[PDB]
Amino acid sequence: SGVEGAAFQSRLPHDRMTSQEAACFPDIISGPQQTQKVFLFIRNRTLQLWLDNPKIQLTFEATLQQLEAPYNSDTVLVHRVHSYLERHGLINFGIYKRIKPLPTKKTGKVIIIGSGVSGLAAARQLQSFGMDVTLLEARDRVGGRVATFRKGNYVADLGAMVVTGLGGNPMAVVSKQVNMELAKIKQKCPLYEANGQAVPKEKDEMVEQEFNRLLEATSYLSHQLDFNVLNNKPVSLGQALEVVIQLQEKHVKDEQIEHWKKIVKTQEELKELLNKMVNLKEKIKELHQQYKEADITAEFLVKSKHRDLTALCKEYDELAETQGKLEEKLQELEANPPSDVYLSSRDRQILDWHFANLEFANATPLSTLSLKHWDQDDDFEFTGSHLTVRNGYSCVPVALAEGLDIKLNTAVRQVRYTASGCEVIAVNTRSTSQTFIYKCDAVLCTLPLGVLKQQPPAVQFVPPLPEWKTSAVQRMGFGNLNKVVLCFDRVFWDPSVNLFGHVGSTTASRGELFLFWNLYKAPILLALVAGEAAGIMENISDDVIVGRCLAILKGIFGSSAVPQPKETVVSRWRADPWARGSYSYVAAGSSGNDYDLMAQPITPGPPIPRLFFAGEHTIRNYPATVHGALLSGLREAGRIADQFLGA
Numbered sequence: 084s085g086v087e088g089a090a091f092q093s094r095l096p097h098d099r100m101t102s103q104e105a106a107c108f109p110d111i112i113s114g115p116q117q118t119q120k121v122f123l124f125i126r127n128r129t130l131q132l133w134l135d136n137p138k139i140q141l142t143f144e145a146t147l148q149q150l151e152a153p154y155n156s157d158t159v160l161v162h163r164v165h166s167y168l169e170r171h172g173l174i175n176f177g178i179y180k181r182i183k184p185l186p187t188k189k190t191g192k193v194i195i196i197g198s199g200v201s202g203l204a205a206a207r208q209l210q211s212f213g214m215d216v217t218l219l220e221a222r223d224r225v226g227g228r229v230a231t232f233r234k235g236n237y238v239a240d241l242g243a244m245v246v247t248g249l250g251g252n253p254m255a256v257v258s259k260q261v262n263m264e265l266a267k268i269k270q271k272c273p274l275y276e277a278n279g280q281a282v283p284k285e286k287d288e289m290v291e292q293e294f295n296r297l298l299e300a301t302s303y304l305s306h307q308l309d310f311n312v313l314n315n316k317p318v319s320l321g322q323a324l325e326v327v328i329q330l331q332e333k334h335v336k337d338e339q340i341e342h343w344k345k346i347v348k349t350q351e352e353l354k355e356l357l358n359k360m361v362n363l364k365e366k367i368k369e370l371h372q373q374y375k376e377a378d379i380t381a382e383f384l385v386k387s388k389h390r391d392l393t394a395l396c397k398e399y400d401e402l403a404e405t406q407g408k409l410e411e412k413l414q415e416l417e418a419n420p421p422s423d424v425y426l427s428s429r430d431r432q433i434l435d436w437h438f439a440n441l442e443f444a445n446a447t448p449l450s451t452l453s454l455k456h457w458d459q460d461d462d463f464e465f466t467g468s469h470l471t472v473r474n475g476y477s478c479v480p481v482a483l484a485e486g487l488d489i490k491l492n493t494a495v496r497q498v499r500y501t502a503s504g505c506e507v508i509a510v511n512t513r514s515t516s517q518t519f520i521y522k523c524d525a526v527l528c529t530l531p532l533g534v535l536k537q538q539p540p541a542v543q544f545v546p547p548l549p550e551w552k553t554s555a556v557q558r559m560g561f562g563n564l565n566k567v568v569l570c571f572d573r574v575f576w577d578p579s580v581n582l583f584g585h586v587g588s589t590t591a592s593r594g595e596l597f598l599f600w601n602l603y604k605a606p607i608l609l610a611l612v613a614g615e616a617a618g619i620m621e622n623i624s625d626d627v628i629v630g631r632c633l634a635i636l637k638g639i640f641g642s643s644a645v646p647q648p649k650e651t652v653v654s655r656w657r658a659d660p661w662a663r664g665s666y667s668y669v670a671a672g673s674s675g676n677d678y679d680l681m682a683q684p685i686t687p688g689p690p691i692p693r694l695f696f697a698g699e700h701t702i703r704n705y706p707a708t709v710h711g712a713l714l715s716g717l718r719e720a721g722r723i724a725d726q727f728l729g730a
């Protein structure tokens with residue numbers, strides 16, 4: 084349906100109130116059911132008006148004018164619902180044409196640290212709400228971990244590049260607003276072994292299905308058998324995977340043992356039977372000779388010796404009847420051995436590609452992921468196919484930056500917060516002698532988790548952050564993932580596949596250049612460096628790592644088919660001082676709850692909150708994504724306005 088679709092697109096149940104709405108509308112939840120349904124229709128229709136045209140501000144008046152009778156008669160309730168949706172960034176978010184120009188006198192000063200998607204999303208909200216907002220950004224550009232390389236006709240994303248399903252995804256709104264060219268990813272992904280040979284289809288399917296089985300077994304271990312703690316330590320996904328593989332190997336060795344036992348027993352029966360048949364020949368050879376050694380006692384002696392001879396001969400033919408039914412049982416047993424091994428050496432390498440793919444998705448070696456919680460956010464996945472941004476994902480933060488007071492090359496060094504306000508201290512990255520002091524009423528920190536983890540600290544908080552916050556910072560995972568960009572003047576790969584895989588020769592290096600992406604107008608290939616390889620490869624110069632790419636590609640397509648690239652770029656996110664990694668993951672011994680702790684604002688001791696937090700590491704249901712960063716900025720903007728302008 085139409086207004087039901089609007090609730091779904093806003094990640095809301097179309098036919099009941101959320102807890103958040105119950106808090107804000109307690110008179111509605113406690114009142115008659117009929118009025119609750121009116122509430123839900125006003126809410127849903129208001130979201131639909133916005134989602135149907137997110138390029139213009141949806142005002143209260145225009146909401147009222149487009150509601151049909153009887154709904155356009157309860158002016159007060161319509162206003163209450165519009166205001167709530169607006170305050171929480173469910174309408175009039177992103178970048179859109181303002182109908183009401185900005186209030187000329189501001190109310191409250193907010194310093195936002197970092198001009199990534201989360202800081203930008205919050206900044207636009209707070210500016211719309213009539214506050215004085217300034218973003219301090221250490222880089223010479225906005226976007227943070229959205230970072231697009233552009234040169235000539237080449238476009239390639241070094242950070243985020245994939246939009247997950249559009250159903251429920253706020254990026255569907257921003258896409259319309261910014262005019263992103265999205266293109267669905269084709270799922271075919273042929274694999275090539277380290278020698279460049281294609282993986283045959285049957286081995287590809289067999290190994291993939293085994294990967295799915297192994298992973299489902301860890302989830303059974305975790306969520307049915309509750310094997311999540313061992314020797315007082317949290318079990319990791321990698322650890323659980325090693326256990327389920329050990330049991331598969333045990334199973335192979337057992338069935339092998341059973342099979343050898345069947346062989347041996349059959350051999351022993353034949354050995355015994357032949358020995359018995361041997362003695363029966365000796366017994367018949369002795370009688371057959373006493374049949375030639377030969378009257379009335381003689382005419383009856385032949386009858387008796389022929390009766391005796393041919394009975395042993397019937398005994399012997401019957402034993403040769405069992406002899407065949409045994410050595411034919413032996414013959415098919417030797418021809419039907421069970422498997423020698425669980426995984427052939429090549430099978431294992433292929434299985435390690437699927438593990439590498441998973442270390443890509445989580446940005447970290449599997450031995451670091453929480454067995455119990457590594458996929459705690461699964462239930463919030465959007466619907467629809469995934470897409471890539473053909474024109475470069477930087478179009479989003481560049482569009483969101485329009486009209487904001489953004490200070491580039493301005494690196495925050497110290498954040499001071501008291502019950503009387505805040506001071507942010509920063510230095511000019513092009514001239515670190517120049518120092519700046521920003522006074523404000525509230526600080527919104529969107530620093531990446533990697534920066535918050537840095538010891539000694541990059542940014543100093545005065546007073547120091549509370550232990551409950553720093554230990555959550557310490558527990559949470561912050562992974563790494565890198566990309567080699569190869570720009571050619573000609574397409575030598577299969578233009579109709581967006582993905583192909585390189586199967587590494589060893590487990591430890593399985594994430595090295597394991598996945599290639601064909602996404603762009605110009606002849607560009609992105610290769611991923613995942614897992615353990617991601618951090619280690621940053622120590623390799625561009626030319627050497629490009630050379631290793633070219634060797635892989637020369638193996639797949641032929642040495643003469645691969646020309647030298649015209650431009651190359653290599654990300655080093657861990658070594659990047661303004662990121663120190665790629666994105667959070669649920670580390671063994673962490674949980675979704677640490678994401679809630681990260682989102683919690685700080686209040687100076689006895690008072691009102693001063694220091695606020697946004698960023699991909701602060702949103703439990705959508706971590707490590709652009710949409711989660713965006714949602715987190717909208718959330719903190721609502722919280723800050725509630726504090727400084729009233730709920």
Ligand SMILES: Cc1cc2nc3c(=O)[nH]c(=O)nc-3n(C[C@H](O)[C@H](O)[C@H](O)COP(=O)(O)OP(=O)(O)OC[C@H]3O[C@@H](n4cnc5c(N)ncnc54)[C@H](O)[C@@H]3O)c2cc1C
Pocket residue numbers: 196197198199200201202219220221222225226227228229241242243244245246247493494495496529530531534541542564565566656660661662664665666697698699700706707708709710712
């Ligand atoms: C390699 C890679 C691949 C990814 N794959 C995807 C994908 O395809 N799709 C997806 O949805 N997500 C993906 N992600 C994740 C997504 O890009 C991030 O989750 C999101 O961009 C983070 O936004 P943020 O605002 O939380 O942080 P950021 O974008 O990092 O914003 C923080 C900002 O603070 C700035 N800053 C740092 N230190 C200071 C300081 N001292 N003073 C001032 N400013 C400072 C930084 O420069 C930055 O601009 C990927 C990320 C990477 C790096």
Ligand SMILES: O=CCCc1cc(F)cc(F)c1OCc1ccccc1
Pocket residue numbers: 242243244245247443444666706707708
């Ligand atoms: O390039 C960036 C990938 C990072 C990433 C981190 C997430 F936490 C969730 C994502 F959706 C995601 O991006 C697309 C993706 C989806 C599934 C598996 C792998 C990647």
